[PDB]
Amino acid sequence: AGDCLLSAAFIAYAGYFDQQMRQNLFTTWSHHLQQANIQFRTDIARTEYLSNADERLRWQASSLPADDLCTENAIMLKRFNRYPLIIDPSGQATEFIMNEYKDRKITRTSFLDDAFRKNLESALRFGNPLLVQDVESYDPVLNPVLNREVRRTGGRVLITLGDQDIDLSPSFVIFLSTRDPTVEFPPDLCSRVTFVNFTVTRSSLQSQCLNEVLKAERPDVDEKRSDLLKLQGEFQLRLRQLEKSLLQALNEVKGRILDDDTIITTLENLKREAAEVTRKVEETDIVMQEVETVSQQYLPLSTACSSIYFTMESLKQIHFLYQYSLQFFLDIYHNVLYENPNLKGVTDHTQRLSIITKDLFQVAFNRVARGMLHQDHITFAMLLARIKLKGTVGEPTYDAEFQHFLRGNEIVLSAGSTPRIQGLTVEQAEAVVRLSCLPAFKDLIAKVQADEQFGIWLDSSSPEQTVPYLWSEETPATPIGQAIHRLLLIQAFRPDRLLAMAHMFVSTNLGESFMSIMEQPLDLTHIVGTEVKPNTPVLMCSVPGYDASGHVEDLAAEQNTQITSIAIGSAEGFNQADKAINTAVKSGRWVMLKNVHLAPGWLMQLEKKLHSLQPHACFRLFLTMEINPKVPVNLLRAGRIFV
Amino acid sequence: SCVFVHQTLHQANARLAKRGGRTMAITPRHYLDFINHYANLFHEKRSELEEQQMHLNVGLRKIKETVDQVEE
């Protein structure tokens, strides 16, 4: 009774809140039930109570992310009373629904589409699951069906739509989806439909990456972790069916008054199977250091992955061209765990985790920086360096040092606060007195006064290479601590070398060859060969005064691939591009679109068409473009950027 | 307990609104949906578990029959 109460409370409610809020609500309900002694089982999980093994495996085959939030969302999607409203900024929910309902030939439809009403009536007549990818422009014709106003006239279930009456089919289900996670809805909407949030929060992506690394790397020990998954699987099934077969043979009303009844010995096998289930539960108890450890060894990896991806999202603030989706980071993750030559000859597991995280950082940087201006490469490199520094456990967190390094200029000074140090300019003196606020730099002015090599170092071409020892610390510092302290010194002293010393700091953090790939030109042949999907177009966004056609032409010629190059100048260009792409989808040849920035709406239409299309594996779409804000954000999110 | 669940959902919505995050109104229609889901889940799980329980009780009565058999 209590377990069903909690299950239904979680099903009807908690459909919009994130993982932390859902857990808080569940904890509050469980605490209240405990106070009233409503006996509810605690060992069971919400993801398991309402789900079956066959359904879970079908969802896995239907490409359900392993995150427990997504499993709960699938559970709510399966059983409901009001038609769900899915919010999927990632975009995984739409493909999950399509794969799940492919057998029922679910038809896609958009509210903006004029044929939406025709698709709706077709779904009602035939009884087909229907999906609408946009509901922000809500059309109120669904108010009656959402309210389920049904009139039972004769043997007919009849729905009043507008001024027409349409027969209803029980098999018909309508699914509402929104791409925007920031949209607000009128209260009638949240009253009429239930919410199924698919927003990928920090905890959500953290758990997803943890499960992905558990499955991909450590695969037979992923089955050692799934010893918990099999304890009540193919294991307890044998116990229960052995009990029921024993019941089948228990009294067949045969051999009455017979001293021969060895069938009792099969209860020994019953006890052995029950003991197998219970001892696998005790293996889940051994998870006090078994699977909790398989999880916590990769916990830094998953935390770093979440931090990396949210840095990747928030990178859109510094420039309109830096638009990256979940699928891009997931492709990065798959390329790190799979098809990685660095682990071909590597078997040790801790070292495999170490090389995996190193290659994760390296591949993430080498994939992001290709579509990033050269003036911003050091920014993302420093962000990744900070992420790795936080991840590693030995080093101090260095919050105060980084906070000062970022917010020194906000500190207010006075005319008398500057002691007018000889050999230093006024702005330099302000920097000295400001940075002396740090406890490690309190005696800095004395070091300025005492030192005599300051004159040559301050005026040297590259002071960052030979920064002297000024900060005073009672204990020897880590190389990273020395690097950040010298970075602060360079910022306060010779800000012109700040970028170079940032390069050195990233080198100390993430390896001396972290940027070594950047100096080399783009290896377009490998990028277009593998690691890119045929559906995803290649974006070559060049600044004014430069074209990217030559590099892709050389690529096509050297691969001996026939490529159709067309320019976007007018409607004739539109028709030629459409015909070329339609031919190349099935033939597999390459097609180039030049100066695509001229038509933003046509670009949006092309993105929408590309999503629906099914390109051949050899198909590659190159969109050379000018870097202007007129380009739709959706294409940038749905394509690989190369600046 | 169900009433308290609804009240805490309202309180959580109010707290989320105070924090500044996006919130959606909770209507008594949500309470009706919760009660209906509770009814459906209770019926289904009780049906399955008690069918198995009835099988087990019939088995126990048959065990008593076998006890009588060994008795005579």
From Swiss-Prot, chain A:
Cysteines joined through disulfide linkages: none
Top-rank taxon: Eukaryota
Compartments where found: Cytoplasm, Cytoskeleton
Annotated region described as AAA 5, given as residue ranges: 50-279
Location of region: AAA 6: 502-643
Assembly and interaction partners: Homodimer. The cytoplasmic dynein 1 complex consists of two catalytic heavy chains (HCs) and a number of non-catalytic subunits presented by intermediate chains (ICs), light intermediate chains (LICs) and light chains (LCs); the composition seems to vary in respect to the IC, LIC and LC composition. The heavy chain homodimer serves as a scaffold for the probable homodimeric assembly of the respective non-catalytic subunits. The ICs and LICs bind directly to the HC dimer and dynein LCs assemble on the IC dimer. Interacts with DYNC1LI1; DYNC1LI1 and DYNC1LI2 bind mutually exclusive to DYNC1H1.
Its biological purpose: Cytoplasmic dynein 1 acts as a motor for the intracellular retrograde motility of vesicles and organelles along microtubules. Dynein has ATPase activity; the force-producing power stroke is thought to occur on release of ADP. Plays a role in mitotic spindle assembly and metaphase plate congression.
Name used for this protein in its record: Cytoplasmic dynein 1 heavy chain 1
Name of the gene: DYNC1H1
